[PDB]
Amino acid sequence: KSDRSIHLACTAGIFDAYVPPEGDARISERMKKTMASQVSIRRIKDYDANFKIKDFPEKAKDIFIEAHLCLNNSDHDRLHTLVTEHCFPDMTWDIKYKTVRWSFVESLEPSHVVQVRCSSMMNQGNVYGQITVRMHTRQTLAIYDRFGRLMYGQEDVPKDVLEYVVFEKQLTNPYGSWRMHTKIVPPWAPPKQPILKTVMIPGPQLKPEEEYEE
Amino acid sequence: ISRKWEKKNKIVYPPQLPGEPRRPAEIYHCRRQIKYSKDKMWYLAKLIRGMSIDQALAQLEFNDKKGAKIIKEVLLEAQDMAVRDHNVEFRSNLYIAESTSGRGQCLKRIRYHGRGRFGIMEKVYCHYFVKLVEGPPPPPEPPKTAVAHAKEYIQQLRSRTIVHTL
Amino acid sequence: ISHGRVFRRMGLGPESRIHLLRNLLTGLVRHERIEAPWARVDEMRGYAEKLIDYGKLGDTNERAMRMADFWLTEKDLIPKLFQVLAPRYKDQTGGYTRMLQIPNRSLDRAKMAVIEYKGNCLPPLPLPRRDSHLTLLNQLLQGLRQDLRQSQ
Amino acid sequence: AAPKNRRTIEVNRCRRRNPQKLIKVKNNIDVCPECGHLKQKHVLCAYCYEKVCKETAEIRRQIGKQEGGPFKAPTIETVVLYTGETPSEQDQGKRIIERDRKRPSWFT
Amino acid sequence: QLSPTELTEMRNDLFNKEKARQLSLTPRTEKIEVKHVGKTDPGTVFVMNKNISTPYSCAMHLSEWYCRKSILALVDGQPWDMYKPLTKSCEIKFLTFKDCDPGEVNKAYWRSCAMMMGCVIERAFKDEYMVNLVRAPEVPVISGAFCYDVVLDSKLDEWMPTKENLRSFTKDAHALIYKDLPFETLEVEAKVALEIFQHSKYKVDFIEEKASQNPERIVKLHRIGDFIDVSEGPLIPRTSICFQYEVSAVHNLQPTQPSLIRRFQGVSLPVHLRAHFTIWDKLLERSRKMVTE
Ligand SMILES: [Zn+2]
Secondary structure, eight states: OOSOOOOOSOOSSOTTOOOOOTTTTTOOOHHHHHHHHHHHHHHHHHHOTTOOTTTHHHHHHHHHHHHHHHHHHTOHHHHHHHBOTTTSHHHHTTSTTSEEEEEEEEEEEEEEEEEEEEOOTTTTTOOEEEEEEEEEEEEEEEEEOTTSOEEEEEEEEEEEEEEEEEEEEESSOTTOOOEEEEEEOOTTOOOOOOOSSOEEEOOOOOOTTOOOOO | OOOHHHHHHTOOOOOOOTTSOOOOOEEEEEEEEESSOHHHHHHHHHHTSSOBHHHHHHHHHTSOOHHHHHHHHHHHHHHHHHHHHSOOSOTTSEEEEEEEEEEOOOEEEEEEOSTTOEEEEEEOOEEEEEEEEESSOOOOOOOOOHHHHHHHHHHHHHHOOOOSOO | OOTTOOSOOOTTSHHHHHHHHHHHHHHHHHHSEEEEEHHHHHHHHHHHHHHHHHHHHOTTOHHHHHHHHHHOSSSSHHHHIIIIIHHHTSSOOSOOEEEEEEEEOTTTOOEEEEEEESSOSSOOOOOOOOOOTTSHHHHHHHHHHHHHHHHO | OOOSSOOOHHHHHHHHTSTTTSOOOOOOEEEETTTTEEEETTSOOHHHHHHHHHHHHHHHHHHHHHHOSSSOOOSSOEEEEOTTOOOOTTOSSSEEEEOSSOOOTTOO | OOOHHHHHHHHHHHHHHHHHHHHHHSOSOOEEEEEEOOSSSOSEEEEEETTTOOHHHHHHHHOHHHHHHOOEEEETTEEEOSSSOOOSOEEEEEEOTTSSOOHHHHHHHHHHHHHHHHHHHHTTSOTTSOOEEEEOOOOOGGGOOEEEEEEOOGGGSSOOOOHHHHHHHHHHHHHHHHHTOBOEEEEEEHHHHHHHSTTOHHHHHHHHHHHHHSTTOEEEEEEETTEEEEOSSOOOSBGGGEEEEEEEEEEEOSOOSSOOEEEEEEEEEEGGGOOOHHHHHHHHHHHHSOOOO
């Protein structure tokens, strides 16, 4: 029952997550969702009156590109600087003993600020703001083994990608910044590129007294 | 103490050029502080040196030793970490490169003898070290042939020089 | 030198060997399938064949009654022997038991053996079965046997 | 009688790594095909025998439950019946032992 | 007229070009789902590469026991080679020599031994003399000797082989067994099959009949090293599966005109079913006896 409590700089959820509209990638209530977005916008503006939504998306793509370059060169300090504590471990622990070759080629269309949401005051005296941004870019990816053998992707071939990246800033923090919190992938998303190796999924392991049922 | 076997298991390599051999996978595993003698554990390791993973599992399953059971568990979980984390394709595509027993940290107990005499028991412990390499097991070295013996003798005879002169 | 010695030196003596084999035989008659060390199972297998011979000799015979009285220590198996087992093997001549090797005891690594009376109601043991007649060598030998039948 | 001198590690290695002291490789290991598990050619399969042992143990437990006490071994033969079948006309005067499971495929 | 070395080299070139054409027809990796429905290790799901992975690859995923004992594969109930690529999601079942009904495995072994004999024939006779290969008749297992029909030279209509010649055939076949070549399989169009075997009228007729019975006119070619032949079905993975081999007898068929057909008969037994010396001798004598289809 010590008076020192854990001082978190982020949350681990999305406040009213943007549900993906069907056919957004296939094609090359609005007033209510808009009005909620700008209610959250005047909350960010009140906590910091120097924020521009029209100026966000270039900073968002900058944060994304530099975070993935820090992922390329294993710069965990700058990755902490640009990436929230909820997004860091599911960024790094699947690549902890692997080599990742990532690059940014171009953007097909400019990124779009598509959702803005805010927290309540009660969150331990802290108020957080999240902004969801559509990105649709062309990237390259080549993840290597512990031994240097190739596992995923191709070295030179670029491919299209569409993500719903959600950034979060702690507004009450005097030194808070906009960092990547997560990314929504749609449930209707196209299936990912197949892996380069073969996988055996085992069946049930049967005790002697048990009989296999189909 | 030292845990360089685990650090060997977590060493990492640079990416591979597309015009060189595949550099087959290497998996390091060990069990520490096994209540068993390192000599008998050496006998079991020397039994399973150089075999395939399935062959080693068969021999350890049908051996009659507590160390055989322990090494079978170690090999099973080493194969599990092999095709779970080190990107080994087939779970049967492994062989034992290194199989070693080491001395553990033992304890001293008193052994009461006759008269007023005593001895010092050792509660002996041991480690087991294993290394798994992806690939078929390497072929055993063939025995030397009479042709090879004759060639070696003739090489010695032709390598003879006149000693202690110009 | 142990030339022509057909019996094993078991237990604490000859009396203890007989008592051990009697306990194993009583267990075999009660449960119809027991497991025990291999040597004891072999000796008690021989005694079980001879016990079924006495049971087929029958309950009205005083010698067979005395033999069953000695070799069955629980006294309910004597009706079970004389009116279950001998009626079961009345048709058969002398192959009353089945002995198979089961691998090793998990404590002292002892060579184990399961022994059952034939017939039973228990689930059958995973018996060693010969190769099917549809295998390659078996079809070649069947063709050979056919050709010899046509020849002679 | 005591050792006159200490035996060296070379002599000790020769003695302890003589090929008689080494563990011989077993050749009589084959896949039991009813379950795909390793067995020895002269030995019953451990997995199948273990299955048979647990089913037999449950049979004997039900026999004891019907039996109710020692020194009451029956005069009649016994059969085992599972769920979903009637006693056959050859199993008339035999003690029926009921089991609350489907009849295993390896049991006829 | 081309030399036999040139004919072999061009046939291997055509085989490799067609195989590369199929591998280019499947350029990108694609994941298929194979459900092992065998009695042992039941209901096991494999994620394999389309037109690249093999039943041998599935067995290597499972254990080396399946690799060493599995001879044929049931893919959706049809017999499949161990080294033949899988083309679709299916169910697999490995077949050994010692099953309840090993008849398909026996047929595959029998065809493989006949094809190896024909290779030994073709690379055994002399260059001044001509060798033409007719077919390997699908003779049943119970007959006792695998048979292979050869047209030999007009200068050799009168020549009968001797025991040393038969032992030389056996030694060449054992050299193949030692060499341990995999049985490469290719499902190929009839036009490419005719282009491969265009300098053999009997092979042309064989390919034409296979393309007639099959509506899409695809036939099966098999290769051990350099020798290519048209097969009647699935084959065993490797020549090292054969342990005991013998070229027992050579006979001449009844119609001498228009050409002399010579039936070469041998007998074999694999490693998993090797017989004793005396049993093998009796099988040798029955294989030396005539076999009619
Ligand atoms: Zn089994």
